[PDB]
Design a protein around this ligand. Sequence first.
Ligand code: HEM
Ligand code: HEM
Ligand SMILES: Cc1cc(N)nc(-c2cc(CN3CCC(F)(F)CC3)cc(F)c2F)c1
Ligand SMILES: Cc1cc(N)nc(-c2cc(CN3CCC(F)(F)CC3)cc(F)c2F)c1
Ligand SMILES: C[C@H](O)[C@H](O)[C@H]1CNc2nc(N)[nH]c(=O)c2N1
Ligand SMILES: C[C@H](O)[C@H](O)[C@H]1CNc2nc(N)[nH]c(=O)c2N1
Ligand SMILES: [Zn+2]
Lengths: 413, 418
Amino acid sequence: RFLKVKNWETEVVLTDTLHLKSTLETGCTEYICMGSIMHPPEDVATKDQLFPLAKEFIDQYYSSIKRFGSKAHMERLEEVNKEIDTTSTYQLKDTELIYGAKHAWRNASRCVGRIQWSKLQVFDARDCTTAHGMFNYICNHVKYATNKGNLRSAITIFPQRTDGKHDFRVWNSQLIRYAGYKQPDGSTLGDPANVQFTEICIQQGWKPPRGRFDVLPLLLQANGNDPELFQIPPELVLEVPIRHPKFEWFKDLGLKWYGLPAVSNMLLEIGGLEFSACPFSGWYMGTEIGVRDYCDNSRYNILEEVAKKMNLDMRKTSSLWKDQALVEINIAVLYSFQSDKVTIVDHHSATESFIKHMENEYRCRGGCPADWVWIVPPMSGSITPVFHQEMLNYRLTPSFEYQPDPWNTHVWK
Amino acid sequence: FLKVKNWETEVVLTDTLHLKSTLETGCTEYICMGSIMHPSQHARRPEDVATKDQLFPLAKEFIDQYYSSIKRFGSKAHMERLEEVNKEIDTTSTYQLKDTELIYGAKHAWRNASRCVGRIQWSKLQVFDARDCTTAHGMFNYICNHVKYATNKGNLRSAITIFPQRTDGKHDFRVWNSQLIRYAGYKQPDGSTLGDPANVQFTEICIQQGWKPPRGRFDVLPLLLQANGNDPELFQIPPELVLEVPIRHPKFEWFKDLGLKWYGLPAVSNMLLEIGGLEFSACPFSGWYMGTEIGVRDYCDNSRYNILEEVAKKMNLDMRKTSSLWKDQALVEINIAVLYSFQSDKVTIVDHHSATESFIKHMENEYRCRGGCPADWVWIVPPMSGSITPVFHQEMLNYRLTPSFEYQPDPWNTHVWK
Ligand code: HEM
Ligand code: HEM
Ligand SMILES: Cc1cc(N)nc(-c2cc(CN3CCC(F)(F)CC3)cc(F)c2F)c1
Ligand SMILES: Cc1cc(N)nc(-c2cc(CN3CCC(F)(F)CC3)cc(F)c2F)c1
Ligand SMILES: C[C@H](O)[C@H](O)[C@H]1CNc2nc(N)[nH]c(=O)c2N1
Ligand SMILES: C[C@H](O)[C@H](O)[C@H]1CNc2nc(N)[nH]c(=O)c2N1
Ligand SMILES: [Zn+2]
């Protein structure tokens, strides 16, 4: 009936009642925790499956606006039911769509940026029918979100799933990523994470510049048709050349990154409806770029390069040359974005804000599901306040969800 | 049967050992509690002296496990041990472990410690039977020998000293210190805190028991030892047994002038060791430090020594905003310094890269021969530079195997004085 979480640095204790509203698996059992497991078409919901999911969401939406039990609430409910009876599915109103998209972000236990959840620009693209249409919608998203460096968070929602045979999909995992090319000598040019997607693009006819920071083309699928290539207009892709405020040589590494993090491979679930193409964007925390993108061994792997220029002893790990070069890379990233007036947040500010957000969510909502394994930044963990903050993890809906990669299930026409 | 995947190597391991899990983790299908410090209160035995139907099944299970370990099970010595444990509980409401059973159980408690990154060495543990102990003086003698053996003039060795098991609950043996060696914390009149803030309350009890504090920043605390439920007694560990390392920096000549030191021997002394239903309330165990425990947590936690600003100021760092990452930069230098100092003084220490790499290897070993290895991601990943260590990218399954080390309440919330 109640659960308590404690911050071990501050002694603050919060009481989670909201977890009673969750209704879907975490992956754990009573005797084994799967808290660190990353992921613990005909599966479209039947009529009888969809009825209670829509009732739940419509009830939740009318509760949120202090109209529960109202005439408008009850008529909406039977209107939804009629659609499900006739058409085996239903259509959200614009208000419900905006509410669902904002709450799916609010409910994202792994996102540390949720203090901003209520300031989200929703772009209703449910009238889209072609890949060309999707490209137009996505170009307008990118230009709005980027806002000349003064980033604004936003989502564009494409038509919901029907029978699973007519999905809309953004095949890109983000709207802006760099290409990756495996060389014959075993080495990799560009971003090793995107090698397979780069190969899918090329075979579809993309002519790659074969460089280190080639912005990839969009690969867009509408209504279950084969996906199509489109080149984002270069003037819409804002990029930051990475330099260091004290190390003159750092600009000579030749590094840049894009300004706009825009995840496009997830699935938005509102009231049992599945929005298979729903790309969303915000702004970066510095460590996403500085620690993971640049320094993962499977990613750009520049630690060794930077330590060399730093003149560090790299013969023994206990010199902490890796830790040292990592801090400088992350200083360079934050300094570069700030100098070019492109929105960014360091891990300290971001985690402190999330703690403020968590306490408020407990205050007014009864809790706030949170995934410690993801909330804690990938460097300097215990000197950030979330490290010392107990967190409960559960799955509320609307939610953002993973889905399989399109090329693992699409059958080509 | 569950799989775990490492996302750096794509190695996938397959866990069947979790089918032997006994106690609740705290999680359910609908709520994960994997970042709660004490998620469960599910114990294997009720409050005080258990009835025969309560203790015997736990006993039978441990003995079954142990004889299974040595390729008996059903052997003559196994069936006689069952009858011996049964007659013993019938006649005393408890039973006593053979020497071999005690050693097997302590080593497997360590092997089962999901939060411990050090378990590659689990089977190389020195076990000191102190179950004949009767007084706090005896407990001090045993602890001194432990510390001396374990320290080994800086070539540290792993050890545990096991004092008599809990009988009725009003006769517990307890080390009141949380570790055998810690520094005092003193509440200053101006509201600040001198020494280690974590130990302010234990330091007060010591002072309140007659300890004369030297009132410094690194005052080794006295032992506060409780035998057979009686009042605890203060003892000063002979200083020549308390190895300490003065912290200096391989490049910053000014670092030594910060006047920082730490001790060499981490010896956890407030935990409970549970073997076949038996509860060893006093079982101090020790190994050697991972550098980050001292340099990240002990020195840089806000509720601890909090030395970040002072090191950052000495380094001439832009301390007016977070985004300069001055905290992160000082943090790295401190950990370079702690490591360099322990190594210069030839005192055993391991950095977080070496230690996490070893644990991945231990994991591969455990799955290969045991069918799994319980591990708590939240505690295994180091508190700096997490994602540049291999355990960050390693999925882990957490579950509670027995024998185990458990938490227990601080004795001063529970003890009736006399
Ligand atoms: C406004 C600034 C934002 C910041 C600073 C931020 C920060 C982060 C970070 C650091 C992660 C982990 C990413 C990783 O480590 O790979 C994350 C995850 C996530 N973000 Fe946010 N985020 C922001 C905005 C948004 C928005 C606008 C949405 C949706 C409308 C969103 C939805 C999510 C989701 C669903 C995840 C987790 C995906 C998963 O489960 O893997 N975020 N966020
Ligand atoms: C020999 C080298 C060892 C290393 C490097 C090591 C490392 C660690 C570290 C870093 C932690 C986390 C502590 C914290 O962050 O507060 C830990 C936890 C733990 N260690 Fe080990 N350890 C070692 C030996 C041992 C031994 C000999 C035992 C018992 C016989 C043991 C039992 C435990 C237990 C039970 C925990 C969890 C304590 C808790 O749940 O609060 N360790 N270890
Ligand atoms: C809006 C937003 C802001 C921000 N700073 N960051 C992200 C983000 C989120 C993921 C999570 N992401 C899910 C898809 C996946 F493919 F499953 C892999 C994990 C990954 C990233 F690279 C990201 F930049 C998103
Ligand atoms: C043998 C050993 C080696 C090593 N390198 N480290 C530790 C250790 C373990 C904790 C865990 N500790 C338990 C008591 C508690 F009260 F439960 C709070 C958590 C704390 C430390 F400071 C520690 F040095 C132990
Ligand atoms: C194995 C582990 O689950 C995996 O590395 C997780 C850990 N925590 C993370 N946290 C964030 N923010 N992003 C990640 O990709 C991961 N990866
Ligand atoms: C809230 C969180 O569970 C708590 O701060 C944990 C996190 N992980 C940890 N990991 C280690 N090794 N030691 C700790 O004390 C903690 N503290
Ligand atoms: Zn769990």
